[PDB]
Design a binder for this molecule. Structure first.
Ligand code: NAD
Ligand code: NAD
Lengths: 268, 266
């Protein structure tokens, strides 16, 4: 077996899916977890306006709607949290997703006071935080907010990690990677778009002739989501793009595992 | 068929008897071997509170960095210790005695209370009251953010203090003090942690000490019973039930976020 075949097996990506069936697989998986853990009543997720948190939010809300209808228990709710950095941050994209999700609870918590206070307390010790590190600080502060809300409403924190993000470890360790359950895990980027299309999401929520332009995530990675998805579907990509993808994989192995103990061997 | 006690001991890798001198080497060599395999890592980062776990983990990381410098001649290999108090009223005497024994390369002090209080204010601003217990987990996560911020600036890895006696009961905050990069103490119980601290020449005020300890009061079971359990001995039916109940409740803390492919929760 090759590294590509192994990575595909590890992430459980299928070269082709049934988007209608995958939506049911995602929802039934969520519902099955609630039933086995009666102490869990709510689902919490930060809604950023992006494809991932929109799809994971809709699947979470659809799960809770079925739960409270099957069980009659009205405690089953999904809580959406808008987590802007600052008070003049554009939230048009976020509430466009909110209109599609239709969450039972819609909250807004500004993370700028906490992040700025933590940055200041760090500068008080000679630690100046770079621009990119501050981004990781924002993702971890958003992790704290979602877990603070779940810690009050007997909830579980939904995670937006999927296959295309996991190969590249394109997430903040214990930031957006810090969550309780992963409804999107197994799907690549374009497969996530297919599920959003299956759920009747307005086309402006996953998209935005000549070549398609690049998004911020692809500029950082040096490889497009189409190559990443082709790779995870078992298709042959260029030697250059394959090297980029597998380099990100080995680079982010520590994010794909629990904290490293003396018994681990994956890193050697 | 194998007991749950045997599975847990195998899973956590506890030994009924250890060699404290050898176990000191096994942790130091493990930390150095990871740095050697990852030349982009140059520092270790750990919050120092004064307790047994962070003191033993801090000394082991500091010792490993000293050997790293002497073997390679690269002076950038440093251990960074951060005092992470909540406010000013918090007593510093116990954390100070830990730093006197560790003698770190870099000693920082970051107060998490401004960030934590701002988080609470923004949450209460949205109608979310925060209880004292939920606020406790928020402090452990804010401390995690501080440590990873320092590590993100210094090409560092965050040292974790989780051990066997803490993993059975899952007595840590998910992505709080449980969020770390490398666990030098994983396999040791609570008393084995004391034994290594003795081997390392730590003063007895750091690990020796009927009075009530806060951990055992919340856990409903003593550390001596947890350590007897992890050493393969037989414990009372009451204590065995208490421990195994914590183990099943904290299974989600011992695994990555749940995917559709997992079955341990079923
Ligand atoms: N140029 C960019 O666009 C850019 C820059 C920085 C970060 N990001 C994004 O932030 C997120 C994470 O980036 P990040 O990795 O820089 O921050 P991160 O906090 O998620 O990961 C780095 C941390 O993990 C630990 N670590 C690093 N190497 C380790 C190793 N071999 N073993 C064990 N622990 C190790 C360290 O504690 C380090 O601080 C991603 O989504 C990334 O796309 C993007
Ligand atoms: N009386 C006390 O002394 C006391 C009380 C509470 C907490 N604590 C301390 O805080 C530490 C953390 O414990 P905690 O549970 O209160 O906070 P925690 O954040 O570590 O665990 C609770 C969170 O984990 C998630 N979760 C809970 N059950 C889950 C499940 N079955 N599946 C998936 N996710 C689940 C939820 O997001 C929940 O909000 C404790 O170990 C203890 O050290 C002490």
């Amino acid at each position: 077996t090759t590294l590509q075949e192994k990575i595909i097996q590890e992430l459980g990506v299928l070269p082709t899916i049934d988007p209608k069936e995958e939506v049911r697989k995602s929802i039934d998986f969520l519902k099955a977890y609630l039933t086995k853990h009666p102490f869990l009543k709510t689902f919490v997720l930060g809604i950023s306006g992006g494809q991932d948190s929109t799809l994971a939010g809709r699947l979470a809300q659809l799960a809770m709607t079925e739960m409270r209808e099957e069980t009659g228990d009205m405690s089953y709710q999904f809580i959406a949290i808008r987590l802007p950095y600052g008070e003049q941050a554009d939230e048009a994209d976020a509430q466009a997703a909110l209109a599609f999700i239709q969450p039972d609870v819609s909250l807004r918590v500004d993370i700028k006071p906490a992040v700025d206070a933590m940055v200041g307390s760090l500068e008080n010790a000679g630690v100046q935080i770079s621009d990119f590190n501050k981004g990781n600080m924002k993702a971890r502060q958003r992790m704290i907010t979602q877990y603070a809300v779940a810690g009050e409403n007997a909830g579980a924190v939904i995670g937006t990690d999927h296959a295309a993000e996991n190969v590249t470890a394109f997430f903040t360790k214990y930031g957006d990677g810090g969550a309780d359950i992963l409804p999107l895990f197994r799907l690549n980027k374009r497969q996530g778009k297919a599920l959003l299309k299956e759920l009747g999401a307005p086309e402006a929520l996953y998209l935005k002739e000549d070549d398609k332009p690049l998004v911020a995530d692809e500029v950082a990675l040096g490889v497009t989501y189409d190559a990443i998805d082709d790779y995870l579907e078992g298709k042959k990509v260029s030697e250059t793009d394959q090297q980029t993808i597998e380099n990100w994989y080995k680079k982010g192995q520590h994010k794909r595992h629990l904290p490293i103990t003396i018994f681990d061997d994956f890193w050697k």
